Amino acid sequence: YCPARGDVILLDFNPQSGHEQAGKRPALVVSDDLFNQVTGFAVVCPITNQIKGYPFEVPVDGTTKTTGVILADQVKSLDWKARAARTVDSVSGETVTTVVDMVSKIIK
Amino acid sequence: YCPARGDVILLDFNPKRPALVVSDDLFNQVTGFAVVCPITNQIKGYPFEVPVDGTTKTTGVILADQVKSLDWKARAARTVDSVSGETVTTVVDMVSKIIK
């Protein structure tokens, strides 16, 4: 198994502290398949069902069971091995394109 | 204080560390997030390594494959240095290749 670009994955969130409860969190994979396999990292954007109309929220579209918004400005390269990533879903191509567009705007 | 694009900042770590800020200035100020890549003295020759350039005290490579958006205030971000524009462009060039 390796995460694919466009996948919705569940990642272990395992803080050793803080008020936020440990557990699995959904996120969208925006990094290339080959990157993910070779580095053992995956660049991901968190997914949430809290919809505030925040400018960097990208609505999840083209899925089977997954709802909510992607938070594009929270983009992170995460260790999908250590965090035991599991692919549970996937989004549309234009969903990924929208998120990546936001990120590239942020870093340019 | 706010992190600027091109800044080398020190960040608190977890289970202080240098990182390059690639996110836009106004983005860092408004959102409270900084998109950064870690800098390391180990040169392993990975294809995603970018050599640091145009700096005073800072050496090593920037890891584009480890890019993270983080809360810079919560990590007590402080700017100790900066890098050349061509350096940021190269890092950002690698990141966009990764996610496209």
Binding site: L11, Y54, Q74, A82, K105 | F33, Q66, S69, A74
Partner: peptide, 29 residues
Amino acid sequence: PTLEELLGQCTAENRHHEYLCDSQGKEML
């Protein structure tokens, strides 16, 4: 839209806490 245009609509009511703020395994930061 433009980064400026995007950033212009950020508010106090709008913003999100940082998800997945922990560091695991290989992560440097």
